[PDB]
Amino acid sequence: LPRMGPRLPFELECPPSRGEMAIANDLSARYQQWVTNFPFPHEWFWSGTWWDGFDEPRCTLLEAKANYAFLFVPLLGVPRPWARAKVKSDLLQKAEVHSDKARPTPPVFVEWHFLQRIVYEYCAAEYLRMGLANLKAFWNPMPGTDEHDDYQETRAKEQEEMKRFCEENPG
């Protein structure tokens, strides 16, 4: 039952709106534009911290991660041993500093959207064991990819598994 992703608007109480857009220093670029609708390399800079995107209506800061499966063993579910340094600094440490830098935890949520599934699966578990309550992880792939394909048939196989179970039961 993977987390359902909301949609994103366009752009140009919830503090992050006191930030602005800055320049950060192309499969990865495309996917962040698809998750954030932020033009070129612009990113949201608030609380002295970088965020890939910002949903001001939903009061949610956004981050997108793509092309990190080569750093994992695709079946065991663990990162390759030599790649533990990159996973720590790129995927785990930056995700802690994000959960730490939100103040009103009722309105301010953070969401990490992963193109790839095994990267989402690892991160979602590692985020729960770190005490990151206000950070949710999503497998939200941009279309025209192998993933989007396995995404459509996964939600299709859920409605199928739900079709049989529901009509033969109360729930």
Binding site: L76, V78, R80, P81, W82, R129
Partner: protein, 238 residues
């Protein structure tokens, strides 16, 4: 024995962040050096240690056990809130053959001052007697780091979803508790190893824990409950 579907395992040891922060770059490097020396006799995959890399080939360029002067190259020092960070790996790419890495971070926060080995499950593939060998590692850390405040070897699946107190740590299959414990207060198959004035090592059975058989599951659950009842079970964030 090598298997096709094995169990991911967490192997973590926490330290006092305040005391560990004040160690300089030179004292940190002797701790890690001693640690790698204590790992060497336990299995041949734990002899060599390589550096992290962008690719697989870049991660095999430098051998810190063959070239010892290159160990200082893998120690970071932040300008605000000095925080050392060290990541090695043994040199094996496949966890099924013993591929494992060493992550040693001490920044000054309770949650961020720890030492761990990624996928203890790789060691389960290589360890004939996993109990005796893992206890050796614990005793090595306690010998080398007197600042140790906790340690936990537990299945990743258990500790994330099935553990008794979700706002607390766990003792896992083999955990360290920094107190004197009483063999009366724990299940029969749970055996203790007191450290002179340091604490107790718990061993919930000598057989590797499983999260699908009830004989293993109840043994560490009762253990966790007694630790919480005595007020020795720490919370997660701290």
């Amino acid at each position: 024995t090598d298997a096709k579907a094995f169990r991911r395992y967490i192997f973590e040891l926490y330290f006092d962040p305040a005391r560990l922060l004040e160690l300089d770059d030179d004292q940190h490097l002797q701790r890690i050096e001693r640690f790698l020396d204590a790992l060497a006799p336990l299995h041949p995959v734990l002899e060599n240690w390589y550096l992290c890399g962008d690719s697989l080939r870049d991660a095999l360029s430098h051998n810190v056990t063959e070239h010892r002067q290159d160990l200082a190259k893998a120690l970071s020092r932040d300008r605000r809130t000095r925080a050392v960070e060290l990541v090695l790996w043994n040199g094996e790419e496949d966890p099924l053959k013993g591929g494992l890495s060493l992550d040693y971070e001490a920044s000054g926060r309770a949650v961020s001052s720890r030492l761990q080995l990624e996928d203890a499950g790789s060691l389960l593939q290589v360890f004939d007697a996993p109990a005796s060998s893992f206890v050796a590692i614990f005793l090595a850390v306690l010998e080398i780091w007197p600042e140790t405040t906790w340690g936990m070897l537990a299945p990743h699946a258990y500790f994330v979803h099935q553990r008794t107190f979700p706002d607390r740590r766990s003792i896992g299959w083999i955990g360290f508790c920094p107190h004197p414990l009483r063999a009366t207060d724990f299940p029969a198959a749970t055996e203790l190893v007191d450290i002179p004035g340091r604490g107790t090592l718990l061993l919930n059975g000598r057989e590797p824990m499983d999260e699908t058989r009830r004989e293993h599951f109840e043994r560490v659950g009762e253990a966790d409950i007694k630790l919480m009842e005595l007020g020795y079970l720490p919370p997660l964030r701290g």
